[PDB]
DNA sequence: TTGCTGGAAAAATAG
DNA sequence: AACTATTTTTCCAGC
């Protein structure tokens, strides 16, 4: 049986259920990196998959593979591979095999555990778009294609010769590291140019502007060179919520004969930095 | 050393 | 070719 085939959750007395859905969020790890864990449950544990209606007494194999996010087109995702985790914290044995270009990871579904299984041994590896897209015949695009689904399936051998094949897909999971949390970001400036002298006040409205927010003007080179840094004084004596009043600093060289492009950003901590804002100093 | 990550800087890209 | 604005990969540091 193919991985693309539209199997179903149930089939008469049989029914594959995802007792515990994974978290909506899970950062995948790259080859050039160390494992980033197994998919975790929103609670704190991990996902749980169970087969209902298996009165038989023989352990079955539960397959796991990462697939696309759209239900209508459950396909294994071309830019992600299930990753087999192992060792101490991993209460579930597991073997892996390749099927097509897909890594599939099998887990045991045991009658003694009521065909109930804990998926704490499956992590997610991220392939490089470039590498995948060079594969002849593939047309899926990687860029911005970071949602995926954990796809579970099992093959039920009926003593009557034929096998019932079931499958269940988890809720989508976001695999791209969400970078910000408590970051401050400018959305509206007030002034974007000024004379080398500065002294002019610039109003800045954005998000997450704390009582200890700072504004730093910087100048680079076309080769990304930090040739100028300079903190701007921010009227903290008073201010509206998410609105910072900045005093444009004087440009290092008041003798420039042509306008110079420069950047400024907002900082709340040694690592809490906004996106680089644009500014221009004009020769007097 | 294994994982295992959080946080990021460095490297790539789309327009 | 070079820019910016965004995304993706690689690195680094702390267990």
From Swiss-Prot:
> Where's it found, cell-wise?
Cytoplasm; Nucleus
Tissue spec. comment: Expressed in thymus, spleen, heart, testis, brain, placenta, muscle and pancreas. Isoform 1 is highly expressed in the small intestine, heart, testis, prostate, thymus, placenta and thyroid. Isoform 3 is highly expressed in stomach, uterus, placenta, trachea and thyroid.
- Relate the induction remark in this record: Inducibly expressed in T-lymphocytes upon activation of the T-cell receptor (TCR) complex. Induced after co-addition of phorbol 12-myristate 13-acetate (PMA) and ionomycin.
Complex formation: Member of the multicomponent NFATC transcription complex that consists of at least two components, a pre-existing cytoplasmic component NFATC2 and an inducible nuclear component NFATC1. Other members such as NFATC4, NFATC3 or members of the activating protein-1 family, MAF, GATA4 and Cbp/p300 can also bind the complex. The phosphorylated form specifically interacts with XPO1; which mediates nuclear export. NFATC proteins bind to DNA as monomers. Interacts with NFATC2IP. Interacts with FOXP3. Interacts with TBX21 ('Thr-303' phosphorylated form). Interacts with KAT2A.
Pathological condition linked to this protein in its record: Joint contractures, osteochondromas, and B-cell lymphoma: An autosomal recessive disorder characterized by musculoskeletal and hematopoietic issues. Affected individuals develop painless fixed joint contractures in early childhood, have osteochondromas, osteopenia, and can develop B-cell lymphomas.
Record's function text? Plays a role in the inducible expression of cytokine genes in T-cells, especially in the induction of the IL-2, IL-3, IL-4, TNF-alpha or GM-CSF. Promotes invasive migration through the activation of GPC6 expression and WNT5A signaling pathway. Is involved in the negative regulation of chondrogenesis. Recruited by AKAP5 to ORAI1 pore-forming subunit of CRAC channels in Ca(2+) signaling microdomains where store-operated Ca(2+) influx is coupled to calmodulin and calcineurin signaling and activation of NFAT-dependent transcriptional responses.
Q: What is this protein called?
A: Nuclear factor of activated T-cells, cytoplasmic 2
Q: Whose protein is this, by species? A: Homo sapiens
Which gene is annotated as encoding this protein in its UniProt record? NFATC2
């Amino acid at each position: 049986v193919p991985l693309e085939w539209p199997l179903s959750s149930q089939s008469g007395s049989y029914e594959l259920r995802i007792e515990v859905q994974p978290k909506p969020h899970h950062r995948a790890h790259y080859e050039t990196e160390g494992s980033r864990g197994a998919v975790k449950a929103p609670t704190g544990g991990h996902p749980v998959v169970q087969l209902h209606g298996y009165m038989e007494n023989k352990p079955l194999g539960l397959q796991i593979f990462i697939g696309t996010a759209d239900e209508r087109i459950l396909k294994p995702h071309a830019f992600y591979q299930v990753h087999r985790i192992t060792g101490k914290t991993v209460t579930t044995t597991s073997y892996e095999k390749i099927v097509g270009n897909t890594k599939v990871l099998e887990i045991p579904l045991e009658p003694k555990n009521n065909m109930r299984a804990t998926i704490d041994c499956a992590g997610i590896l991220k392939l490089r778009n470039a590498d995948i897209e060079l594969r002849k015949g593939e047309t899926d695009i990687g860029r911005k294609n970071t949602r995926v689904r954990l796809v579970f399936r099992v093959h039920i051998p009926e003593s009557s010769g034929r096998i019932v094949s079931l499958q269940t897909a988890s809720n989508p999971i976001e695999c791209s590291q969400r970078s910000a949390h408590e970051l401050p970001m400018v959305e509206r400036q007030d002034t974007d140019s000024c004379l080398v002298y500065g002294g002019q006040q610039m109003i800045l409205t954005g998000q997450n502007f704390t009582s200890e927010s700072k504004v730093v003007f910087t100048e680079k080179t076309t080769d990304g060179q930090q040739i100028w840094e300079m903190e701007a004084t921010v009227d903290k004596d008073k201010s509206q919520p998410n609105m910072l009043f900045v005093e444009i600093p004087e440009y290092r060289n008041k003798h420039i004969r042509t306008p110079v492009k420069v950047n400024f950003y907002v900082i709340n901590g040694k690592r809490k930095r906004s996106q680089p804002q644009h500014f221009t100093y004009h020769p007097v």
